[PDB]
């Protein structure tokens, strides 16, 4: 009679896409191509939260990382790839419940650290991360060049 | 006539000495990390030597198969670290060290060469530009404990 978290199945790709496009606006086929791979992967977790009326109101994606993640001292570590809750549902703390499901899952992979990141100019994401129990570790500038 | 060479198991001394300046830590920690690196196919570590066979620069790099911020390809080469003695920077040995990674990376089927730096290390940012890198993203990292 409230909210409910579940790992995403192929049957729920549309509900996943609808929220995923709000988080990361992009071409539908790019999303779907990625979504279909992720659900076959053991090192990936993707969840949806539903209401009574079967409305998908939140999603989370996470991974297990074996390469060095900034701010960490162990490997592997869990990593938050994306989380999105509809505004009307933020005060419900379903985001806390989603995060907690990753930790149970990450514990299976012998992880003791759960990392994430956010754009430097997105302070709201910084406030959200702290509200979920994350603390800041490092601020980083990324560079790259083409290899000719 | 500076010479750039991959680091052998008998050059830990020169490597350690430059590696300690770049990342101050304790010797036995460095050393056992260094010994592991040498055997790894996805890793490259170089030293630059002068005429007098004085070690004046070092570089470490890796191939990354997991997502690196700012890139759109996988895998990518990644600059793990680079140090040139202050006195030898004006010689552009850092440039010659980067080039050796690219050749190595090309031959690993990479097309992008990524790196990062602490936000408060503007000198590194100036150095990355000097080496031909351009900025892709600025990012804050977070963490919480599980067990
Ligand atoms: Cl798999
Ligand atoms: Cl359903
Ligand atoms: Cl959210
Ligand atoms: Cl980002
Ligand atoms: Cl190997
Ligand atoms: Cl330098
Ligand atoms: Cl860093």
UniProtKB/Swiss-Prot annotation, chain B:
SUPFAM superfamilies: Acyl-CoA N-acyltransferases (Nat). Residues 2-147 form the N-acetyltransferase domain. CDD domains: NAT_SF. Substrate binds at residues 23, 26, 67, 80, 116, 137. The keyword Transferase applies. Keywords: Acyltransferase, Antibiotic resistance, Plasmid, Transferase. Catalyzes the transfer of an acetyl group from acetyl-CoA to the 6'-amino group of aminoglycoside molecules conferring resistance to antibiotics containing the purpurosamine ring including amikacin, kanamycin, tobramycin and netilmicin. This is Aminoglycoside N(6')-acetyltransferase type 1.
């Amino acid at each position: 009679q409230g909210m409910n978290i579940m790992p995403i199945s192929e049957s729920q790709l549309s509900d996943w896409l609808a929220l995923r496009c709000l988080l990361w606006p992009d071409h539908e086929d790019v999303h779907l191509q990625e979504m279909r791979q992720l659900i076959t992967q053991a090192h990936r977790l993707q969840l949806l939260a539903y209401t009574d009326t079967q409305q998908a109101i939140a999603m989370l994606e996470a991974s297990i990382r074996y390469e060095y993640v900034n701010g960490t001292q162990t490997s592997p570590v869990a990593f938050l790839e994306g989380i999105f809750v509809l505004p009307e549902y933020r005060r419900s703390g379903i985001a806390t419940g989603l995060v907690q499901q990753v930790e149970i899952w990450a514990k299976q992979f012998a992880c003791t650290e759960f990392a994430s990141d956010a754009a430097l100019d997105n302070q709201i994401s910084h406030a959200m991360h702290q509200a979920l129990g994350f603390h800041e570790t490092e601020r980083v500038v990324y560079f790259k060049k083409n290899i000719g």
